């Protein structure tokens, strides 16, 4: 679909929170392990994401995630609006984390290894290749 | 120069550490405010960076930054090797942080606003546009 659409959701593992952003058109993922599921953590994650990619619109499976003043400020400043692929990309990431978990002490390390594996896996291009292609083409 | 080359250095501000990664060929920046200047923080940052972009080689102005076992493990796993633009990109970021600093409570928020401003500024393409173009072209 549209190249500026991202989906953001949190998932829970080992008593920690993983914020997962999916670029809907490519299946590319960005993720961070956050101390708590708060509006200030979501706002900070959104500022980082928007500085890296041309973020136009954000989707989520939990609308209340985006009600804080912190989040609304991040979206206002960065010029962001609110509105099977995402379910599939999140499923694949949770399974990859499980598969690499014993290779690291920290959950956050296993998460970043799973993001890397996911983005680099060709399906024939990878999600990492598709995002860069989708965004470059849209610039032209 | 080569599209897989990144430069990583830390800078200090308000008693905190900012890890700054520059994509040498585009001038694109990624940055994080880290609790301390440690090998484990650098290793974690490198895993995140390598999952997002095709990182081949890393440069730094402080070689001792990359001696820890943590860093060597991150580079080994991600398949990374060691070897005016970077000085210019870091200079521009420090000045942008100064210019936006009073708009936020936290230094980390001002840092991410400065990264966003820097990557989106056209010079006529922006660093954010150039990185995506350089990487997409290299895939083809
Ligand atoms: C926490 C951590 N420590 C690491 C390392 C590597 C060496 N050390 C030092 C050390 C010393 C004594 C040990 F008994 C011991 F087990 C590890 C990684 C690490 C770093 C990068 C990395 C991998 C590991 C395990 C796995 C493959 C992907 O890349 C870690 C690591 O944590 C940080 C990334 C935060 C450094 C971890 O969670 O295990
Ligand atoms: C820490 C923080 N709090 C924020 C917000 C916004 C509302 N609030 C709540 C609040 C409540 C009462 C206040 F007196 C008060 F001043 C702010 C931003 C924030 C979030 C996004 C953002 C901006 C700000 C100021 C500036 C432009 C770029 O986008 C913050 C912010 O910190 C996080 C990003 C970690 C949430 C900050 O450092 O100020
Ligand atoms: C995105 As959840 C807090
Ligand atoms: C608040 As968001 C768009
Ligand atoms: C890159 As500095 C620790
Ligand atoms: C250790 As690095 C390449």
Numbering used by the authors:
A (entry chain A), B (entry chain A): 56 to 138, 149 to 188, 193 to 209
Article, verbatim:
To investigate the mechanism of GSK002 resistance further, we determined three high-resolution crystal structures, one of GSK002 bound to catalytic core domain-only, one of GSK002 bound to the catalytic core domain containing the Ala124 substitution, and one of GSK002 bound to the catalytic core domain with Thr125. These two substitutions were chosen for study because they were the most influential in reducing GSK002 IC50 in the study of diverse HIV isolates. A model predicting GSK002 activity using the top four most influential amino acid substitutions (K20R, A124N, T125X, where X ≠ T, and K188R) performed well under cross validation, where the cross-validated mean-squared error decreased from 8.49 to 2.26. However, the azaindole core of the bound GSK002 ligand is seen to shift in position by ~0.5 Å, depending on the identity of the substitutions at residue 125, along with movement of the difluorobenzyl group by almost 1 Å. Substitutions at residue 124 could affect ALLINI binding or the catalytic core domain–CTD interaction. Substitutions at 125 may also affect ALLINI binding. Larger substitutions at residue 124 and 125 would create a steric clash with the polypeptide backbone of the IN CTD, disrupting the inhibitor-mediated interaction.
During the early steps of HIV infection, IN catalyzes the initial covalent attachment of the viral cDNA to host cell nuclear DNA. An additional class of IN inhibitors, the allosteric inhibitors of integrase (ALLINIs), act at a second site on HIV IN.
